[PDB]
Paper text:
The Thoeris defense system triggers abortive infection (Abi) upon phage detection. Two ThsA effector variants have been reported: a silent information regulator (SIR2) and SMF/DprA-LOG (SLOG) domain–containing effector (ThsASIR2-SLOG) and a transmembrane (TM) and macro domain–containing effector protein (ThsATM-macro). Collectively, our biochemical and structural data demonstrate that the nucleotide signaling requirements for ThsASIR2-SLOG and ThsATM-macro effectors are distinct and suggest that ThsATM-macro effectors can trigger Abi via membrane perturbation by a mechanism that involves nucleotide-induced oligomerization of its macro domain.
The Thoeris defense system in E. coli CFT073 consists of a TM-macro ThsA effector (EcThsA) and two TIR domain–containing ThsB proteins (EcThsB1 and EcThsB2). We expressed and purified the macro domain of EcThsA (EcThsAMacro; residues 62 to 278). To define the structural basis for ADPR binding to EcThsAMacro, we crystallized and determined structures of this protein in ligand-free state and in complex with ADPR via soaking, at 2.7- and 2.1-Å resolution, respectively. In both crystals, the symmetric u-shaped dimers stack against each other, forming open-ended higher-order oligomers. In EcThsAMacro, the dimer-dimer interfaces are predominantly composed of residues from the β6-β7 hairpin and the β3-α2, β8-α6, α5-β8, and α6-β9 loops, with a total buried surface area of 1060 Å2. Our data also demonstrate that ThsA macro domains exist as stable dimers in solution and further oligomerize upon ADPR binding.
Author numbering:
A (entry chain A): 65 to 278
B (entry chain B): 65 to 271
């Protein structure tokens, strides 16, 4: 079984094996809190989806995107404090769930970076990113297709849940999307794209319950 | 029906109709971020579970409790800022999920208060409180009985979710608890208590 459609409180949500970059419509790439763009296996890694987007899929130079983000008008709440101590990498912190749209890609600030440029989140941070993100897309991209990976199944560490399964992350994503879409009467059309090789690990049948919040 | 036991990650979580104050073991009362104690229908309502506890069940004086909390030594993360502008009530703010023990009662910092002193939470606040709260009780009160109400099903307003239902709050509580106990060999023994007048609108059968 490689695809499932579920009714989540009135909206059809699709979970399917595939390649995110082959999806038509809006595609979500998970960046870090600084919206770093330097793929040198030091800040951003070449195996991440964040570095893979920049390496082979970004339109234009990395230097052009940096200036588009630097000269972008983020809400007063989406802008955080500036880490002047950051040695290697950008300095402006952004609040999780922040979205910078770039052609048909939604670059979202997902993971945090510690003093040792390690990608991490706490479970409260993870659930808070999801709720904020789901709010922004259901509000801004109502009725538009949005395709997302399994947030946090890559190198991002969820503190104290290092062994969390992609199947648990997937259920959480559906629980938090339900909480969000239930306040919107025309939410986004959500597709969760699972890497074709990882789909054999996940039992899509263990997830259907999350469409009702359990 | 009125009671169900759920096999959550191997642990049993009881959901029952009844009166929280009649439970054996630990009973959780939700306070605000300042741990205020002035039941006066402006900063703490006399109808809230917070008010009923202080008015009808607090063993000791409110002053004994305020001072005991003041002189209590929380963690460094649990102690946040100090609203000096605070026109009324305590000024020390605590991080949601902080617990102060008071006999067989766990007084936990749950709701936030605004300028008008409205009890409120963002949905990310609510989920963060639960994860931070569950982790504390699963670590400190492992194998001990902890009874709780449905957090958020009272005067507290979850922003953008003014009309969230008690059944939906119960569902959030149950899967945020699962995430928590996941990382504990011996979690706490959780009993979620619903008020008899609300088990009609909630179908524990569904769940």
């Amino acid at each position: 079984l490689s695809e499932i459609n579920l009714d989540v409180e009135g909206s059809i949500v699709t979970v399917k094996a595939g390649d995110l970059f082959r999806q038509d419509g809006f595609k979500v790439i998970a960046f870090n809190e600084y919206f770093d763009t330097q793929v040198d296996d030091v800040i951003i890694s070449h195996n991440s989806l964040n570095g893979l987007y920049i390496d082979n899929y970004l339109a234009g130079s990395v230097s052009d995107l940096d200036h588009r983000i630097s000269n972008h008008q983020f809400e007063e709440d989406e802008l955080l404090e500036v880490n002047h101590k950051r040695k290697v990498g950008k300095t402006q912190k952004y609040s999780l769930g922040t979205i910078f749209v770039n052609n048909d890609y939604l670059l979202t600030a997902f993971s945090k970076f510690d003093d040792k440029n390690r990608a991490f989140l706490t479970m409260p941070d993870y659930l808070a990113f999801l709720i904020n993100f789901w709010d922004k897309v259901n509000r801004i991209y109502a009725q538009k297709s949005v395709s997302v990976p399994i947030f946090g199944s890559g190198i991002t560490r969820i503190k104290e849940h290092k062994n969390i399964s992609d199947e648990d992350l997937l259920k959480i994503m559906l629980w938090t999307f339900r909480i969000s879409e239930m306040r919107f009467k025309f939410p986004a059309k959500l597709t969760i794209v699972i890497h074709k090789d990882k789909i054999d690990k996940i039992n899509l049948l263990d997830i259907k319950s999350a469409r009702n919040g359990l």
